[PDB]
Every structure is written in C-alpha cells, then in structure tokens.
Amino acid sequence: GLPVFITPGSGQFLTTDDFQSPCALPWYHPTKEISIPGEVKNLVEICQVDSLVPINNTDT
C-alpha cells in the first residue's frame, strides 16, 4: 500500500465542491444534442437586456 496521509477537511461535504464521482449509469449514451436557437452561456447576456422599471410603486 502506498503510504498516504489524511487531510484536515477530509470526508466533509461541501455544497460548492468539485470532484469526480462514479456514475450510476455506466455505458449510457446521452441523446444527441441539437440545434436549439437562442442559447445562453453567461448570465450577463441577460443583464444586457432592457426590462421595465416599476417606477410608480404607490399603494395605489
């Protein structure tokens, strides 16, 4: 056995982590992707769109 050493933080679950993880569906072959107009890559794409401002927000 290759001598290893455990690390502070080990075995924890972090909602933002990023690790590999075996798959439950070996050999599955995703349905081929296709031509879907209007794609999105980055939220900023949106903020660059004019939306209307609820200026008049009186209880009325």
Binding site: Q20, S21, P22, C23, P26, W27, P30
Partner: peptide, 25 residues
C-alpha cells in the same frame, strides 16, 4: 494534463462521461 485558471493537474479517473468534474469555458 495540467492547465492555468483565474498550474494544476487533473486527469479523469473515471471511465464515463458524466463522472468528470466541471467543464471549462
């Protein structure tokens, strides 16, 4: 294979598509 970000190594240890970590951009 290892790269640059916002160096480090990272090979996929798993035999399947989905198991991989997060994508690049």
């Amino acid at each position: 294979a290892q790269v640059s970000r916002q160096n480090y190594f990272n090979i996929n240890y798993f035999k399947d598509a989905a198991s991989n970590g997060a994508s690049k951009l």
